Design a binder for this molecule. Structure first.
Ligand SMILES: [Zn+2]
Ligand SMILES: [Zn+2]
Lengths: 76, 118, 135, 91, 95, 305
RNA sequence: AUGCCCCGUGUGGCGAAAGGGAAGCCGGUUAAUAUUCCGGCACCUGGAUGUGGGUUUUGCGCGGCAACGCAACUGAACGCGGAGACGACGGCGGGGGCCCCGGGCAGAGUUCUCUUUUCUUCUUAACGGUCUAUCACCCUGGAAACAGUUUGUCUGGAG
């Protein structure tokens, strides 16, 4: 697992063809949003504070890549 | 809580290749985790001191890391230490200089012997 | 008397250039605020010319005749002085403390050192200086 | 504060082995556990590694010597005699 | 004789005791005499002899060890080599 | 600026050269900081803009905190106090770089060969000098403050290390391809950097994009000495090299900051003379105008308009 | 390159599920297997071949006094060295886990009387990034009125 500190590098990671999946995790107790992208070798996590930048990044992401919001319970 | 643990491999004996350490898992259990032996630092080829700048790893892990991580930018770097290289340089220089001096004195003695014979 | 003077040939015993032969461009016995010890300003040969043979073609001869130089500020404790002396007129004041401060000046000085040393080598003197030390 | 009147280093052997044998082992044990001055570096750090082997902790030199002393009187006498026959042979 | 000369030198003149200070004295060129003990390592002995040949200073090979050289200088420590920079009232140079 | 008249002068440390001069960013002080050798001189120059009220305000801000450790704040000599210099700060080694915070309460000094004390933060009100970061990988060259956030940039020969001052932590490492970083500057927006090097390469880094240069360019034959952005809304930045020439660049940063910035060379400024293989050493921009002043190894400063 | 040259060192195999040794963790799942299945997240070894970087128009990178640092840093034969790779016992120090004590949330039990009570959960893996961690080594300097220093008396003009 690798951490991305910055949204643009997160965007070209999502633009890469290795980018298998993408999800949004919201931590309300901590007041933060993590954007995670799963690629061929690594899972990249970008941590952002509560801002308009998360929702604006959500449309700024590629549309072919499926973006999913993490539910409260990870059901099997 | 269950605080007692078991081996996770079929070797039941406390040999040197059966080293473990205790972890606590996110499931809340205490468990063993089998670990490898501790690597050791490369030693100087002349005095046997530990060479600074070089990692202490198991022998095959040196094939995975890059060359500047395994060397020091100096002659004999990664084999000999700086003090031993310095003694090598000084000793080499002094001995070849004394060889030149002895050759010159031998030529003088040969010339003196030739003059005495002639 | 003092032997660590200008044109004195020394051997470097510490650092990246350990074992290389240098010539003292300027001795600073009293020291400097940056280097508060007896030090020297030297120019040396990082890569010596290769050995050449009477049977070699001319083009191979100038190919195996290049010299890679360097310039250094060096502590006296890391120098081994030699009885040899290298009188070069093109090496007078090619470096100073401001040269080692200014990175364009030092790479400009290295070109002068390279040209002067290659000219002296092709002239054919100071074979001890232009041969490497075996240690 | 002297703790034993006569046994010294042989006090580890207790009342065993006999007085004469404890006194005989005491000499060699003292002279083998003592520290000596190095003839190469001048420091008092030469100690016995194994039988016949004497090493210095400072200058890292290893010497071939006696079993329980760093030198043997027969070897010293040989050194003197070998010197004198060396000037006899050379001159 | 050499011990009495060293005693007079310690009493009157100026010396530095030790390898690094002796090397600095030889580099400065103000060294008048260099004393090297018998059991000094041969590499250091050859280096100091080369330095003295370059600076044209005389070398005396003291027959004793570093312990005996320190005792001759009047110190309670060992000394492998030393540099006399000023003879004082002694005549150790005139030899 | 416009006339070229020399209204003030003072010899600070005699033989020691003045490496860096920086005005305090606040309009209300008119306080100049200079570095000569190992010393920092904080002074109020005798200028026509200085009124008695302005001089009194500047004086009380300079000496408010009055009412071996890193940094020795002291009053200067009597002649220096008569000339107008009011503070001298002594550090361990020779200072090469001064940077001022935008509020004017702190200034940082980079002194190469200062080892662990290479980068020092000085608080003027507290009269306090501290070393926040002891170990930095390599020899420090330059420092700067982030224009909008409590971040600190330290340029080493190889890397530019970005630090959060509140947590005193390392938040980013920026990797130019240079062997030796000569200088760097930060965009007023705060997300872009220009890095100039002795390897004749000018590098545009976008901090959101990568840790490696977004743009790599080479317009000079000789080594680059200074880079400087324009402050005040003009999308200009200048590059100063040892060949004695300035290069003026149009660099526009989009406001949405998810579109890549645009860099176009617009001008070559020549006529500055090279002496002893050194050309233009420093560059500065006007606060509101497209005018730049360049320092010279020939001994002249030049204003280009 | 219808032959020639170089080198010496010998001789193969079997022999350890406790020796040596490339690399996997957590959670879940079955009536019965699980570091093997599922989910998530990794690693090692071997191979082929691109792109981006590095070097180069003077072919084989730069910095630091140094210990050495830096994403790379031309390297055939022939040699040198290091790791693998090593006894028993004793006290001392660091780390993990367990044991112990206090507060707080939630739950449970006791409650003739007492008990702001007694007990239970409060966890964080492999693998990475970053900052740190004793010895050891380098620079300056030259120590007696000897000093530093361990529980244990060693170290220092050979600094
Ligand atoms: Zn060594
Ligand atoms: Zn010894």
């Amino acid at each position: 697992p690798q951490e991305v500190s910055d949204i643009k590098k997160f965007i070209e990671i999502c633009r890469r063809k290795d980018a298998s999946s993408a999800r949004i995790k919201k931590n309300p107790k901590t007041q933060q949003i993590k954007f995670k992208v799963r690629c061929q070798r690594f899972l990249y996590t970008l941590v952002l504070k509560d801002s308009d930048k998360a929702e604006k990044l959500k449309q700024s992401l590629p549309p072919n890549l499926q973006i999913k919001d993490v539910p409260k319970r990870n059901k099997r | 809580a269950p605080t007692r643990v078991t081996y996770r491999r079929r070797n039941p004996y406390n040999t040197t290749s059966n080293r473990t350490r205790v972890i606590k898992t996110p499931g809340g259990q205490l468990r063993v985790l089998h670990i490898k032996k501790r690597g050791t630092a490369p030693k100087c080829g002349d005095c046997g001191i530990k060479l600074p700048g070089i990692p202490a790893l198991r022998p095959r892990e040196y094939a995975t890391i890059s060359k500047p991580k395994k060397t020091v930018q100096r002659a004999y770097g990664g084999s000999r230490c700086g003090n031993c290289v310095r003694d090598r340089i000084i000793r080499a220089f002094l001995i070849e200089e004394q060889k030149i001096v002895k050759k010159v004195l031998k030529e003088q003695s040969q010339a003196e012997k030739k003059a005495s014979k002639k | 008397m003092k032997f660590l003077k200008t044109s004195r040939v020394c051997l470097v015993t510490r650092g990246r250039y350990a074992g290389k032969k240098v010539v003292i461009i300027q001795p600073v016995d009293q020291g400097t605020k940056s280097h508060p010890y007896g030090h020297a300003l030297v120019a040396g040969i990082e890569r010596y010319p290769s050995k050449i043979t009477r049977r070699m073609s001319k083009a191979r001869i100038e190919k195996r005749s290049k010299i890679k130089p360097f310039i250094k500020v060096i502590n006296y404790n890391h120098l081994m002085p030699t009885r040899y002396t290298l009188e070069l007129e093109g090496l007078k004041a090619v470096i100073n403390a401001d040269t080692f401060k200014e990175p364009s000046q030092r790479e400009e000085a290295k070109k002068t050192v390279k040209k002067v040393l290659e000219d002296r080598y092709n002239s054919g003197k100071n074979r001890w200086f232009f041969t490497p030390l075996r240690f | 504060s002297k703790r034993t009147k006569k046994v010294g280093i042989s006090g580890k052997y207790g009342t065993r082995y006999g007085a004469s044998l404890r006194k005989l082992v005491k000499k060699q044990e003292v002279t083998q556990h003592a520290r000596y001055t190095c003839t190469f570096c001048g420091k008092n750090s030469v100690r016995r590694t194994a039988v016949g082997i004497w090493s210095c902790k400072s200058c890292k030199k290893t010497m071939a010597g006696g079993a329980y002393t760093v030198s043997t009187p027969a070897a010293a006498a040989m050194r003197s005699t070998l010197r004198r026959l060396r000037e006899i042979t050379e001159a | 004789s050499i011990g009495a000369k060293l005693a007079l030198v310690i009493k009157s003149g100026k010396v530095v005791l030790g390898y690094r200070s002796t090397l600095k004295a030889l580099r400065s060129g103000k060294a008048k005499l260099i004393l090297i003990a018998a059991n000094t390592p041969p590499l250091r002995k050859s280096e100091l002899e080369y330095y003295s040949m370059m600076s044209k200073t005389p070398v005396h090979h003291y027959s004793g060890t570093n312990i005996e050289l320190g005792t001759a200088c009047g110190k309670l420590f060992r000394c492998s080599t030393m540099a006399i920079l000023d003879a004082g009232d002694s005549d150790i140079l005139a030899d | 600026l416009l006339t070229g008249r020399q209204v003030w002068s003072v010899k600070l440390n005699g033989d020691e050269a003045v490496n860096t001069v920086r005005w305090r960013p606040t309009k209300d002080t008119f306080i100049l900081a200079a570095a000569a050798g190992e010393d920092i001189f904080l002074m109020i120059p005798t200028h026509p803009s200085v009124t008695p009220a302005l001089d009194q305000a500047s004086r009380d801000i300079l000496n408010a905190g009055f009412g071996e450790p890193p940094g020795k704040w002291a009053r200067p000599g009597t002649r220096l106090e008569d000339e107008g210099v009011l503070l001298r700060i002594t550090v361990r080694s020779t200072i090469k770089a001064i940077s001022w915070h935008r509020r004017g309460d702190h200034f940082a000094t980079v002194s190469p060969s200062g080892q662990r004390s290479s980068v020092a933060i000085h608080t003027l009100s507290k009269h306090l000098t501290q070393i926040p970061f002891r170990k930095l990988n390599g020899l420090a060259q330059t420092a700067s403050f982030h224009p909008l956030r409590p971040l600190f940039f330290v340029a080493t020969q190889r890397s530019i290390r970005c630090y959060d001052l509140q947590k005193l932590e390392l938040v980013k490492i920026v990797q130019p391809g240079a062997k030796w970083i000569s200088s760097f500057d930060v965009h007023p927006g705060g997300d872009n950097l220009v890095v100039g090097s002795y390897d004749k390469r000018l590098l545009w880094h976008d901090l959101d994009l990568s840790n490696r240069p977004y743009k790599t360019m080479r317009f000079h034959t000789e080594a680059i000495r200074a880079v400087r952005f324009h402050k005040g809304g003009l999308p200009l930045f200048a590059d100063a090299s040892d060949d004695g020439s300035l290069q003026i660049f149009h660099g526009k940063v989009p406001n949405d900051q998810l579109e890549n910035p645009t860099i176009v060379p617009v001008k070559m400024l020549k006529g500055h003379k090279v002496v002893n293989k050194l050309g233009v050493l420093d560059i500065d921009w006007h606060p509101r105008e497209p005018w730049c002043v360049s320092a010279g190894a020939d001994g002249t400063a030049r204003l280009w308009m």
